Chain length 139, copies 3
């Protein structure tokens, strides 16, 4: 597929608490990048930047522990929520806010996960975020 | 990929209650279509109609609120359930019946989501349904 | 895509209890294979064996009933967990441990689901496991 091979996947490998900057941006950070074909995933910002016009698939599963908060996690496209997922609060099991979607992106569009409500104190180990170009679009 | 570029994604953008017809069909309706490459998703019927033989990927996340019902949501292929997902009933958080699968479809096969058990009173805002042709098949 | 068309999907169609061997391996078994393009999914072992170097997408949803256990399900790559999902224990609804990810695999790498914690007594009907080659890689 040449320059139509674009894919990333990243995970949260520890239960370490959020940083001050993560608290300010509420952008969910993934420390371990498993795939980054095209180097279009910015691992410092946990943001995917589309290299070309196309249909992109995204999936995420944000895993939380008991921390007295319910959460809403949203896939953001240029600062606007496209889809959201939800998780509650209990002390029986880790639980996940999961969702996925296909979206059209232009070159330079940015996709990332934002904690719209709640916090991730206690860590978000086992959280995952991945995406790939399904096919490019011309015009 | 030419005529092998087929993709759709749709979401439920409001918490409005189901219509009379939705009550009769128990087919889950998505008011906002984000992607519809090939125009193979029938937005009036929330049904994907395969344009050609191939392997198709589908994912869904049906989000419910507290409404005194648990739900079973099934991906239907020509009126038969292929996969199902489940959600409970509580008043702490929105929660989702989520699943996904790859299936082979022939031209004219129809895929849609059906509420096999329960109801979506209180709305199903944030629900998502998407799919794409992974690759075509000949013969 | 020729030999770049690789895809599988399998489901658990009954609530039958795990076998002795399933108890010993804790590898989750799927009795009904819906898709197996390339015949790279070993249905006896519920293991996908990559035919070539590439980026592969995997998704799973393991559905449990009340059985006095919480579970952790992990996607294993050559015996090492890549991603995990979690489900609790209650008697209100079936519930699912769900996650998905993209990974790079070499020819001969093996991917399967393992019950890292808990059991699936009471069955795991409606569980699903699927995957496909997103694109091949050279070198
Ligand atoms: C990120 O936000 C968290 C939620 O607001 C912070 O935790 C809160 O910290 C308050 C004092 O900074 C404390 O009164 C709150 O009870 C506490 N809330 C929760 C739910 O834990 C977190 O700050 C961390 O904890 C405090 C005690 C300090 O030691 C910080 O250095 C910790 O990181 C925030 N983390 C930051 C700003 O780095
Ligand atoms: C779609 O099905 C719902 C579940 O059967 C309907 O709600 C039910 O409406 C009954 C009277 O129509 C009422 O006795 C039940 O308590 C109620 N059940 C629940 C769980 O809310 C729904 O009807 C809506 O509510 C009633 C009161 C009417 O105003 C309808 O016009 C409402 O839509 C059904 N909606 C339809 C048929 O449009
Ligand atoms: C697979 O593992 C299960 C969990 O260890 C077994 O169930 C357990 O069986 C014990 C006796 O074998 C019994 O004391 C435990 O209470 C029971 N635990 C649970 C949670 O059910 C299961 O064995 C099944 O049940 C027993 C009674 C025998 O009839 C086996 O033939 C059953 O399969 C294990 N299944 C195997 C080894 O095939």
């Amino acid at each position: 597929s040449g320059s139509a091979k674009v894919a990333f996947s990243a995970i949260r490998s520890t239960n370490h608490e959020p940083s001050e900057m993560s608290n300010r941006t509420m952008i969910i950070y993934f420390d371990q990048v498993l795939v980054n074909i095209g180097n279009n995933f910015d691992s410092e910002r946990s943001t995917f930047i589309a290299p070309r016009k196309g249909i992109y698939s995204f999936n995420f599963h944000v895993v939380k522990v008991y921390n007295r908060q319910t959460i809403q996690v949203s896939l953001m496209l240029n600062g606007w929520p496209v889809i959201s997922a939800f998780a509650g609060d209990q002390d029986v099991t880790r639980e996940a806010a999961s969702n996925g979607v296909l979206i059209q992106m232009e070159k330079g569009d940015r996709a990332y996960l934002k904690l719209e409500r709640g916090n991730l104190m206690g860590g978000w180990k086992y959280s995952t975020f991945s995406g790939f170009l399904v096919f490019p679009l011309h015009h």
